[PDB]
Amino acid sequence: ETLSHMRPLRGDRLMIISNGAAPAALALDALWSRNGKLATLSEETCQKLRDALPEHVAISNPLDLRDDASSEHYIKTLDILLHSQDFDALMVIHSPSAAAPATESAQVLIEAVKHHPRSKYVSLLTNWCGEHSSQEARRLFSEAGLPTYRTPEGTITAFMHMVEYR
Amino acid sequence: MSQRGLEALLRPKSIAVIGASMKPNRAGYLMMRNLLAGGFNGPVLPVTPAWKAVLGVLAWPDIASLPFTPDLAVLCTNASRNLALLEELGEKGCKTCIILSAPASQHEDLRACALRHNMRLLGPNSLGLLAPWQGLNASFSPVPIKRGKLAFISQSAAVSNTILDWAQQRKMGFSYFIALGDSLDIDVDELLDYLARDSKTSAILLYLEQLSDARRFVSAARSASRNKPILVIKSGRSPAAQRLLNTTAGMDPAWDAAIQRAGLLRVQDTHELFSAV
Amino acid sequence: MSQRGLEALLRPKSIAVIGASMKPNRAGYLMMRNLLAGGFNGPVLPVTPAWKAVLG
Numbered sequence: 010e011t012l013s014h015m016r017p018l019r020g021d022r023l024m025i026i027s028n029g030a031a032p033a034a035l036a037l038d039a040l041w042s043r044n045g046k047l048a049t050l051s052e053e054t055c056q057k058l059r060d061a062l063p064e065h066v067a068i069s070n071p072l073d074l075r076d077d078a079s080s081e082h083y084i085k086t087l088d089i090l091l092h093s094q095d096f097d098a099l100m101v102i103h104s105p106s107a108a109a110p111a112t113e114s115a116q117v118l119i120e121a122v123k124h125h126p127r128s129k130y131v132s133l134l135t136n137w138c139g140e141h142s143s144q145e146a147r148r149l150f151s152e153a154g155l156p157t158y159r160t161p162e163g164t165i166t167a168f169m170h171m172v173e174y175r
Numbered sequence: 176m177s178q179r180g181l182e183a184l185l186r187p188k189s190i191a192v193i194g195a196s197m198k199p200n201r202a203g204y205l206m207m208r209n210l211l212a213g214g215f216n217g218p219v220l221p222v223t224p225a226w227k228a229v230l231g232v233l234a235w236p237d238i239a240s241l242p243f244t245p246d247l248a249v250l251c252t253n254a255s256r257n258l259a260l261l262e263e264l265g266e267k268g269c270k271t272c273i274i275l276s277a278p279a280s281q282h283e284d285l286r287a288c289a290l291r292h293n294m295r296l297l298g299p300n301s302l303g304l305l306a307p308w309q310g311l312n313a314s315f316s317p318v319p320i321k322r323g324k325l326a327f328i329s330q331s332a333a334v335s336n337t338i339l340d341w342a343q344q345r346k347m348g349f350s351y352f353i354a355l356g357d358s359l360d361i362d363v364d365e366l367l368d369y370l371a372r373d374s375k376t377s378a379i380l381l382y383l384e385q386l387s388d389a390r391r392f393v394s395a396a397r398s399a400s401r402n403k404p405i406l407v408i409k410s411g412r413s414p415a416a417q418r419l420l421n422t423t424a425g426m427d428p429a430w431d432a433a434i435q436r437a438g439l440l441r442v443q444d445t446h447e448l449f450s451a452v
Numbered sequence: 453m454s455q456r457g458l459e460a461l462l463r464p465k466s467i468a469v470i471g472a473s474m475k476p477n478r479a480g481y482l483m484m485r486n487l488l489a490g491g492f493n494g495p496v497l498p499v500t501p502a503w504k505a506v507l508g
């Protein structure tokens with residue numbers, strides 16, 4: 010999967026967003042076991058606090074959009090993050106929820122990535138959990154050339170393989 | 176404390192829904208739909224001042240108007256009404272309640288109110304519970320379930336939804352599925368004691384982040400594992416994860432030693448969890 | 453005649469089901485299920501001496 014779809018790396022700084030805490034924590038544990046590096050947000054990127062993210066979301070890395078996150082929140086966060094220069098790779102985790110259905114979220118993410126001027130400067134990785142409900146989403150990711158993985162630990166392992174190779 | 180009192184939560188004869196709504200995007204709407212589709216043998220009583228009927232079921236304007244005392248109640252409302260609604264429920268005579276949302280500065284008042292009326296509460300910010308053999312689906316989850324012989328206890332909603340979806344893929348079922356939330360009143364050791372005696376359960380799987388009473392947990396697990404196998408996954412082994420989860424206090428080798436001493440076994444990652452299922 | 457009076461039949465606000473039952477092969481069971489799945493905006497009231505509740 011990685012050799013087929015992932016864009017070559019220009020660095021080793023990682024950013025993570027999720028619609029839940031525990032998957033992000035599992036990702037962090039896997040990253041720690043392999044001596045990886047987390048990215049640090051800049052003060053100016055605090056446009057996130059203003060940009061319609063509700064007041065109860067804490068602005069840091071990993072960025073935990075809560076269980077009730079909607080697709081619009083994803084799109085706004087993606088735009089703001091892509092217009093910055095604070096990281097070299099971006100991990101996007103999605104868990105099953107009523108507010109953000111899998112197929113629609115995948116479609117909006119694909120379009121947002123397609124239309125962004127600075128998309129070709131970073132490497133995207135997706136991890137959509139839930140075997141039954143994410144089949145069509147994974148198929149759509151495949152046709153657009155974006156890599157996708159089954160579990161967060163696998164995603165971290167795939168990223169660190171290329172980091173170590175370089 | 177008393178194992179008497181969990182009967183109302185796990186084998187209720189009637190349920191009341193506070194805040195049921197006709198709006199498709201509301202939490203009360205989803206809970207009402209799930210309960211009606213579950214296959215329950217008792218009545219489902221909606222309570223709300225904004226609708227005369229919900230999904231074809233006659234409604235009642237307030238708690239005091241109910242025709243009799245419900246066994247179990249669910250709050251689907253803003254946190255600012257919690258204490259008043261709880262007091263009304265206590266006056267009516269209900270003994271078990273599920274709470275959707277609450278800040279951390281409310282815990283002491285909630286505990287005092289619950290003690291005053293001899294009521295048990297399932298942790299605030301809880302996803303709910305499912306009991307297929309009773310045809311009961313009192314949860315805010317969008318994933319269906321089927322009957323089985325495996326029981327699962329979780330302190331995380333996302334993991335619960337993920338495991339339910341995996342089970343749906345493989346055509347597999349459960350005997351009990353319980354989400355703890357913040358574990359303010361009901362906790363893991365009592366549920367282990369209860370499940371050790373359930374005739375439909377033959378194995379237990381747990382996902383945990385923190386504990387409050389170590390000796391009771393150790394004793395309950397040791398007693399329960401004499402006749403049924405039990406596996407556990409525990410996250411937060413690194414400083415960044417501990418900061419994210421607000422569990423910086425403690426040490427992980429202590430968890431390793433405690434798990435070993437009670438006769439359990441620890442699994443390492445997500446893949447091993449699916450394989451364990 | 454009585455063109456007024458068909459409004460209750462064709463645009464009712466509430467319906468009562470006499471003989472509703474929990475047995476899957478009964479007529480009242482089918483009627484209750486169809487009514488509940490219809491998408492009605494009013495209440496559906498079961499009447500029977502043999503069950504405390506029907507389909508919840």
Ligand SMILES: CC(=O)SCCNC(=O)CCNC(=O)[C@H](O)C(C)(C)COP(=O)(O)OP(=O)(O)OC[C@H]1O[C@@H](n2cnc3c(N)ncnc32)[C@H](O)[C@@H]1OP(=O)(O)O
Nearest residue numbers: 076077194196202223225251252253276300301302315332
């Ligand atoms: C653990 C999980 O993962 S759960 C699934 C994930 N979802 C979440 O975490 C989000 C949960 N939170 C929410 O859905 C929302 O933020 C809420 C429900 C907590 C708050 O929404 P609010 O608008 O603040 O709720 P509020 O209490 O004011 O009103 C809710 C309903 O109660 C009704 N209501 C108001 N007063 C009362 C009352 N005294 N008794 C009963 N119902 C009442 C209101 O009419 C409203 O119904 P309506 O919209 O049909 O008119």
